[PDB]
């Protein structure tokens, strides 16, 4: 049996089983040429996780590794939580306990990563905003069961997420949406789902939010830890609150599903007065071992 | 970090990624008393596999091990494919390359297992039959897109499966059911789904069938390798064909989803002229390593 190293890394947590897993296969010592896309696809389909990734030798010395990223259904050109977990796994696979930055090679091109005391961070490639009709809004309010404190909007962050705010964290936490109504409305509206959030008003850390991500149209009624969602939330918050300094949003998620994800979304004011969107989290290897491959 | 051995075993295959996985946690050297049901549940929810199992010391010397069996949502008192994969994992965990029989302890009581050249076998605890209305039948034919060669029936095998036969293996393989119609009809009818099968008519091995299992009402539009389904198919075939000798049904499944499961369902004529239903398969460990636990 050929076996290569394998780690299943829990992303957005330091505590096992509280985050969102990514299976990461170490193909750093085999020729990517000699591994078919169908083989890769089959492995991702079999693990049945949101994504399964594969580490390969980079195309050029300026990158530390190439990452191929797969869902059970297709290859993605990029995703956030797999990037973070794969970075953690790489460090471990290569016995590296000192790197503070790395550059990942993937379909999207170069993705610089920083590591700060376990906090792994990259710039989100996409975070666009777009207003939604008041009709859409009223219907979504119907589906969620709550009035929003600001107009929701459509955020393009990879997936098509509606972001909507409620009065506080508790209200968001305790929401009980009608999932079939949401699947109906999102299907009708071509959206993946809704990101619901509310502020933790008496938190020591400012700009702390509770978030929830609901995607019943793709049969993820609730995503327990949703990285593309925190970028949406970040980008939304910028439009609504129009921050002038670099602002960190501290997002907690997943407690209704008995998880506990932590995501740090940075709205970074660049030297050109432009804005960039960073996502960061801890990750912890939960399953460590090897996997049989062809 | 406490880490205990872990194997992810592919059931109904000798070839990796072709079967149906079960995650198997080795808790044989820790006190089951000291591990909460919520902990176990959380691990099963996090792996997100059909089942996740845990090996514990048995309650009495007459058993080789106790198995606790979990879906992402609940503990089951029993299931077939997890039993087979967990048996394979146990053998490996305890460096046993010679056992030909074992007895598993679980909620259902004692479950004798035999191992024959890698073929792992147990008696299915439940296999009841029940006729269905011709109205139900005609509708299901509508949902599948094919006429059946015999009356379908309801088989109680754990899940509530309709079993239906078509002209041959190819016809079954090439079926393209309307999944939403099936979800509608099964939801209405309180069934989990349909097991579709057809005979491989020119096969060297007699009583070879291609099977497919569709359970869209529980969001498994197609189960790629379905052990409870092969027991249904076996029990159905007994009623329809009324076999007088012990008959093996050789079931192949999963090619439409790019898998290749093999299940051996035995209709065993007992000394009392009664009938028992055995299920058997190979299993292969695909991920081998350890898992962090609390």
UniProtKB/Swiss-Prot annotation, chains A, B:
Biological processes annotated in GO: biosynthetic process; endoplasmic reticulum unfolded protein response
InterPro entries: Phenazine_PhzF-like
Transmembrane segments: none
Alphabetic keyword roster: Isomerase
Catalytic residues of the enzyme: 51
GO MF term (any one): isomerase activity
Leading EC class: isomerase
Isomerase among keywords: yes
Enzyme Commission designation: 5.1.-.-
Observed effect of gene inactivation: Leads to defects in unfolded protein response.
Cellular compartments per GO CC: chromatin; cytoplasm
Family per record: Belongs to the PhzF family.
Protein name: Uncharacterized isomerase YHI9
